[PDB]
RNA sequence: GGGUAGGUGGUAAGAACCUCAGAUCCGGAGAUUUCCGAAUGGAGCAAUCCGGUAGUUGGAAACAGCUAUCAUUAAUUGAUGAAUAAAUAGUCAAUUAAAGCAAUACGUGGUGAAGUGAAACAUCUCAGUAGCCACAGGAAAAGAAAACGAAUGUGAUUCCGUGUGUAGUGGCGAGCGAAAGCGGAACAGGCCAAACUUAUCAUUAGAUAGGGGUUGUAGGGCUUGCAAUGUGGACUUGAAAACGAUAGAAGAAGCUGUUGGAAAGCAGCGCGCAAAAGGGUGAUAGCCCCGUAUUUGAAAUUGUUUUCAUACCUAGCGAGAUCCCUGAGUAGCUCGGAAAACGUUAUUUUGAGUGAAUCUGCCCAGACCAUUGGGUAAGCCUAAAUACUAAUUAGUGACCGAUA
RNA sequence: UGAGUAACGCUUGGGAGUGAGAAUCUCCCAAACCGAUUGACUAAGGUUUCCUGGACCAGGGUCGUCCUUCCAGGGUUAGUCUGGACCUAAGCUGAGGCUGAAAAGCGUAGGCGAUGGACAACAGGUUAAUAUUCCUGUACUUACAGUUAGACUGAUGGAGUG
């Protein structure tokens, strides 16, 4: 599914309000992007994570 | 082996027509899940004479007592036709 | 235990037959009935049926047998007492054999 | 009552009892199917005693077929007429076999 | 175990047996439990077909009986091992769990309409309802203040009444509608991270296993003393006792006459009651029978409570130092949505982006600033009151009595 | 009520018999239609409707002693036939895996899936009902063991044929 692999945070369903306040259901998807996380110098899996989790990994010196 | 695959012998016009004239043919009713080889083994372990060959019949269940207040179905029968060799004729009753 | 058993003398205290003394030949606990010989004589109109070795003759005319009677209408008959009377019974347990025995309440007679 | 008597019995004697009652049950059912069973209650009595013996035999972790498969006695009596009929039948079969090949062989030679 | 003198289930008579060495029957505990079905050796058109492996018995072998085992996924462990040296991916084996169903009922979460109303209709309502799906449990959810809120104030959560159809919110239209406070039901508060310290990992530890700590009238750590050996738990094993549940035992008291097929009706004379609830008995019986009030009883299984011991947790008030720790892609902010009564806004939440501080600190008191005051976010667990009845036992009805 | 009205959905005569009762049942003789079919063998489907005896509640568009109706008993025999234990086509399922708010969709290796391919039996007789199945006669095929003689055997893979 269109979801993170480190965390489980997924899409956010909401309303698409326009002028005249017309209601139409819409879905916000997470910014899934591919990244490779080294683990004990091995198993550099190409996991699909969000940019928020990517920033967390970057500030943690690639720790997960 | 357990010899629960020999339920009941049956005597009809067809059976008595075959059960005369040199080779005798004895018709029993057997366990519907039993095979021909099991039938031959049961006859060996309970009679003592090896059958020459065995034939099997499956009679399908059918409606009985139709129109009666409570109608009922029949019971599944497997018939086995043992044929002993020439000149031998054993009795189904008396051992 | 049971108020009425198979064998003891019994009489009827209600109905057309009053003071009918008899011996109980058989007790149906489920239907609360009791067959007493000589009492409740009914005469089924015996037909003729011939489909069996015994049915080939089955000689049956005006055979009078026994009809079952409700157990409530029955009452035990006293024998030990010199003047016999109809009464109710207890269920005392005597410690000599530790077995329950019926005893009348208008006298001291066992069974 | 009966369960106490069977408990007194050993295991091997119990398996002898079960096989004998199985045979007697088969005979009773066959006689009933031939209309020759005067006493029709012995079928039920045989089955109950069979069921009881199975219960006592299953209290201990022992089966009834395997235990009798380990040791047993063979059969007898039902041998003489069987071998006579079989010998006659195979002799006839070999005579037909011999005659057929000869007929074919002499036909091909000619 | 109870309990007897009958029993072999109903349409059901008869034939033949069983039963006083205690049958049938009732209760507790077990035994057996074919095939399909989550179905799970493989398949398949469900109740069928086709097998492998390891044993054992017959055969001279094929073979045939009789047993046990053989699905997938996840976790742990061990062995083996590619591209490619090492190492992983992968492969195999062993152990432990998961699958499914139902209670036409309650709970949580995700998704989520329309008929309809507004006398049309698009904002709105219907309604976060129906439906679809996931996960349970015997309840679930919630929960111990970065709170309410305007005071010499209350001090987890939940549920009921009121506050009130109030303040408010609404093409200010149809409509929607709290949070305080007050009166009640029940009541309980606990525990981690970091400091500091111990031991071990090529100790590059930034990791593992222990001691120490759990906060707001700030708490804890650092150093130095006094007083303590207790009280209480949401807590483990046992022992004993009590109250029950699953069969039962005992259980009082009436005759005569009359109509009548039949008395129990009616009449006369009586009797018992901690029993005058009810059912049957040839009409309408307190005293004919079964029962009921009342007194009792359990070999075996099981429930609640109490006592004793036993584990685990659980403990106060000072002094000095002025040093350290207190939960970060977090709180805020911007762009689109939503939750709250609110149609988005102080408070809560998040799809994208950005991004702080460290008790003279941070958040809150309906934009916002200053003063005053309140509280300690970014970690976890939490009984009770609350929701419901497919089922078991007892019972009730100004509920129905074969078109109900 | 319509109303004892419309309708009774393509096929004649006679003789003898049964029976309480006969245009309707049984037998016989004709007669009339089918005859690339109303004839015979089977697939699919139907599921006992098949054979014998009895009955005439109901059903049969009349009648009925009779029925494909009802009751009681009986009937379907395979190494060679039709299908599995052999193989694949369209297609289905599908461990891993990919995709997707959830349910799920797609899909690899494997596994199913005939309407096709490969595989050994023919003639006659017999019962009221079965017959390449039972019986008689004559055959064939595939496995296993022992034995005789000869030969080095050669697949989970390659190739040809199919
Ligand atoms: Mg709308
Ligand atoms: Mg066959
Ligand atoms: Mg007993
Ligand atoms: Mg609308
Ligand atoms: Mg409208
Ligand atoms: Mg309108
Ligand atoms: Mg909870
Ligand atoms: Mg009693
Ligand atoms: Mg009494
Ligand atoms: Mg009464
Ligand atoms: Mg704020
Ligand atoms: Mg809203
Ligand atoms: Mg402060
Ligand atoms: Mg203000
Ligand atoms: Mg804090
Ligand atoms: Mg009804
Ligand atoms: Mg009616
Ligand atoms: Mg009309
Ligand atoms: Mg008329
Ligand atoms: Mg007219
Ligand atoms: Mg006319
Ligand atoms: Mg006309
Ligand atoms: Mg016609
Ligand atoms: Mg005509
Ligand atoms: Mg013509
Ligand atoms: Mg034709
Ligand atoms: Mg029929
Ligand atoms: Mg016929
Ligand atoms: Mg007939
Ligand atoms: Mg007619
Ligand atoms: Mg043949
Ligand atoms: Mg296949
Ligand atoms: Mg085909
Ligand atoms: Mg035919």
From Swiss-Prot, chain A:
Cellular compartments per GO CC: ribonucleoprotein complex; ribosome
UniProt keyword list: Ribonucleoprotein, Ribosomal protein
Gene3D superfamilies: Ribosomal protein L28/L24
Example of a GO biological process term: translation
One Pfam family matching this protein: Ribosomal_L28
Region Disordered, annotated ranges: 1-20
GO molecular function per UniProt: structural constituent of ribosome
Family of the protein in this entry: Belongs to the bacterial ribosomal protein bL28 family.
Descriptive protein name: Large ribosomal subunit protein bL28
From Swiss-Prot, chain B:
Taxonomy of the source species: Bacteria, Bacillati, Mycoplasmatota, Mycoplasmoidales, Mycoplasmoidaceae
Region (Large ribosomal subunit protein uL23): 1-95
Binding partners and assembly: Part of the 50S ribosomal subunit. Contacts protein L29, and trigger factor when it is bound to the ribosome.
Function comment: One of the early assembly proteins it binds 23S rRNA. One of the proteins that surrounds the polypeptide exit tunnel on the outside of the ribosome. Forms the main docking site for trigger factor binding to the ribosome.
UniProt source species: Mycoplasma pneumoniae (strain ATCC 29342 / M129 / Subtype 1) (Mycoplasmoides pneumoniae)
Family to which this protein belongs: Belongs to the universal ribosomal protein uL23 family.
Protein name per Swiss-Prot or TrEMBL: Large ribosomal subunit protein uL23
Curated annotation (Swiss-Prot), chain C:
Protein name, entry field: Large ribosomal subunit protein uL24
Any single GO BP term: translation
Gene name tied to this protein: rplX
PANTHER family registered for this protein in UniProt: MITOCHONDRIAL RIBOSOMAL PROTEIN L24
Cellular component GO terms, alphabetical: ribonucleoprotein complex; ribosome
Keywords: Ribonucleoprotein, Ribosomal protein, RNA-binding, rRNA-binding
Keyword Plastid: no
Region (Disordered) residue spans: 43-62
Alphabetized GO MF terms: rRNA binding; structural constituent of ribosome
HAMAP family listed in its UniProt record: Ribosomal_uL24_B (MF_01326_B)
Subunit structure: Part of the 50S ribosomal subunit.
UniProt-listed InterPro entries: KOW, Rib_uL2_dom2, Ribosomal_uL24, Ribosomal_uL24_CS, Ribosomal_uL24_KOW, Translation_prot_SH3-like_sf
Domain of life: Bacteria
Function: One of two assembly initiator proteins, it binds directly to the 5'-end of the 23S rRNA, where it nucleates assembly of the 50S subunit. One of the proteins that surrounds the polypeptide exit tunnel on the outside of the subunit.
Family in the record: Belongs to the universal ribosomal protein uL24 family.
One Pfam match: KOW
Curated annotation (Swiss-Prot), chain D:
Family: Belongs to the universal ribosomal protein uL29 family.
Organism superkingdom: Bacteria
Stretches the record annotates as Large ribosomal subunit protein uL29: 1-84
Molecular function GO terms recorded: structural constituent of ribosome
SUPFAM superfamilies the UniProt entry points to: Ribosomal protein L29 (L29p)
One Pfam family from the record: Ribosomal_L29
Keyword Disulfide bond: no
UniProt GO cellular component terms: cytosolic large ribosomal subunit
Chain residue ranges for the region called Unknown: 85-110
GO biological process terms on file: translation
The name this protein goes by in its record: Large ribosomal subunit protein uL29
Annotated keywords: Ribonucleoprotein, Ribosomal protein
PROSITE patterns, per the entry: RIBOSOMAL_L29
Encoding gene per record: rpmC
């Amino acid at each position: 599914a269109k979801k993170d692999q480190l965390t489980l945070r997924g899409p956010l369903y909401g309303n698409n309000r326009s002028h005249s306040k017309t209601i139409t259901r819409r879905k916000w998807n997470v910014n899934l992007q591919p990244c490779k996380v080294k683990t004990a110098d091995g198993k550099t899996t190409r996991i699909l994570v969000s940019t928020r989790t990517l920033r967390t990994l970057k500030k943690h010196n690639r720790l997960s | 082996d357990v010899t629960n695959v020999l339920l009941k012998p049956v005597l009809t016009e067809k059976v008595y027509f075959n059960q005369m004239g040199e080779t005798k043919k004895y018709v029993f009713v057997v366990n519907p899940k039993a095979s021909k080889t099991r039938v031959k083994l049961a006859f060996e372990l309970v009679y003592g004479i090896k059958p020459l060959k065995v034939n099997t019949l499956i009679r399908k269940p059918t409606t009985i007592r139709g129109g009666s207040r409570f109608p009922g179905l029949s019971k599944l029968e497997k018939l086995a036709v043992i044929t002993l060799p020439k000149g031998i004729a054993i009795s189904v009753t008396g051992e | 235990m049971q108020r009425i058993k198979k064998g003891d003398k019994v009489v009827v205290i209600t109905g057309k037959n009053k003071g009918g003394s008899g011996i109980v030949l058989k007790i149906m606990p489920a239907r609360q009935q009791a067959i007493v010989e000589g009492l409740n004589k009914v005469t089924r109109h015996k037909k003729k049926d011939q489909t069996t070795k015994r049915a080939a003759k089955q000689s049956t005319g005006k055979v009078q047998q026994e009809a079952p009677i409700f157990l409530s209408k029955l009452a035990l008959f006293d024998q030990k007492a010199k003047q016999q009377t109809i009464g109710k019974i207890k269920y005392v347990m005597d410690p000599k054999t530790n077995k329950k025995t019926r005893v009348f309440k208008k006298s001291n007679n066992t069974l | 009552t009966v369960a106490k008597e069977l408990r007194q019995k050993s295991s091997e004697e119990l398996v002898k009892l079960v096989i004998k009652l199985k045979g007697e049950l088969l005979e009773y059912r066959f006689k009933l199917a031939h209309g020759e069973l005067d006493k029709p209650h012995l079928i039920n009595q045989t089955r109950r005693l069979l069921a009881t013996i199975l219960t006592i035999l299953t209290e201990r972790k022992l089966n009834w077929q395997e235990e009798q498969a380990k040791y047993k006695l063979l059969t007898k009596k039902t041998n003489e007429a069987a071998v006579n009929a079989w010998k006659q039948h195979l002799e006839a079969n070999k005579a037909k076999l011999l005659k057929s090949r000869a007929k074919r062989e002499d036909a091909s030679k000619k």
